[PDB]
């Protein structure tokens, strides 16, 4: 069954069990609410190993600013590109390309709130993500 990579997906965070979600107001959080209409994400590799993460509902692009806050930009910019990698236990991790040298990962806290880039570290559950289908 070829082409599964190009189907929308939910990015599940193992830290608390939330689904990454983009809110129209630009803010981004996590919700265990699998019905939430703002969690269906469309991933695409703009360059080898470099991806955009876009809401199939609003068309916003996941992004990280100069501080480490996750926002949902309306237009694709250099803060929307992440380095997608599989880690040792086979979870995905997403590092800000713009801040790659600082190891700023995309991540959610147990309490559903993003864990700012400067606060993310390798051995944390907050950065471990698992792409799941739409069901």
């Amino acid at each position: 069954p070829p082409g599964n990579y190009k189907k929308p997906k939910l990015l599940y965070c193992s830290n608390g069990g939330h689904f990454l979600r983009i809110l129209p107001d630009g803010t981004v959080d996590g919700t265990r609410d699998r019905s939430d209409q703002h969690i269906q994400l469309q991933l695409s590799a703009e360059s080898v190993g470099e991806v955009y993460i876009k809401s199939t509902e609003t068309g916003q692009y996941l992004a990280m600013d100069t501080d480490g806050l996750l926002y949902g930009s309306q237009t694709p910019n250099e803060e929307c590109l992440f380095l997608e990698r599989l880690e040792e236990n086979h979870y995905n991790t997403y590092i800000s390309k713009k801040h790659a040298e600082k190891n700023w990962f995309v991540g959610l806290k147990k309490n559903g709130s993003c864990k700012r880039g400067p606060r993310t570290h390798y051995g944390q559950k907050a950065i471990l993500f698992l792409p799941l289908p739409v069901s």
């Binding site: 703009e46 080898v48 799941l132």
Partner: protein, 209 residues
């Protein structure tokens, strides 16, 4: 004397547990009561039996836990801990999802792109199908001549990227050529790369006069 009760509900706030296959999953339900309650597990509302999965499962009554080793997709489902004693019974259900995945370079479907032909001024298309966990990047490339040669100093072929994955490109896995010319003839390559490695397959275009 008392009916069962939870001693540590914090560890039970996480409803959905989604895990990559081959990892070990552990569910817990710390409880109290007097006499000490016993513990048993259900899979989808029914008694969870050792024969319900290859290798069965394990439990630690000291930790009120269920342990399932090297989980696979078929382990997907609801898991309920049942804590009982003469005075009462309480339960809690976790949901488990298991996704298989590993870092492997892209794999292409054999046969695509396929060779093609058409008369001058005609149209044609090349298709490529990819299997890839880590997001794949697709480039459609033509083998060309640069400064009088098909191959460079390293013996490798001169390549021209005609199209590649991107928000400014449409339908990455198909290269459509329109109102062709005898110059478009040649070898077209579908090169697919992810951070682990790459794969490529090619086809030819023949132009009939």
């Amino acid at each position: 004397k008392r009916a069962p009760y939870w001693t540590n509900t914090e560890k039970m706030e996480k409803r959905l547990h989604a895990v990559p296959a081959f990892n070990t999953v552990k569910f817990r339900c710390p409880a109290g009561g007097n006499p000490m309650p016993t513990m048993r597990w259900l899979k989808n509302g029914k008694e969870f039996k050792q024969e319900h999965r290859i290798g069965g499962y394990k439990v630690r009554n000291q930790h009120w836990s269920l342990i399932m080793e090297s989980v696979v997709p078929s382990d997907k489902g609801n898991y309920t801990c049942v804590v009982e004693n003469e005075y009462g019974s309480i339960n809690h259900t976790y949901h488990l999802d298991v996704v298989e995945r590993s870092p492997h370079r892209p794999i292409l479907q054999a046969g695509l792109p396929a060779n093609a032909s058409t008369v001058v001024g005609g149209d044609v298309e090349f298709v490529c199908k990819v299997y890839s966990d880590a997001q794949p990047h697709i480039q459609w490339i033509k083998h060309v001549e640069k400064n009088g040669s098909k191959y460079g100093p390293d013996g490798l072929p001169y390549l021209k990227v005609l199209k590649h994955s991107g928000i400014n490109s449409s339908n990455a896995e198909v290269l459509a050529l329109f109102n062709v010319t005898e110059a478009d003839a040649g070898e077209y390559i579908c090169k697919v790369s992810n951070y682990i490695g790459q794969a490529n397959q090619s086809a030819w275009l023949t132009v009939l006069p």
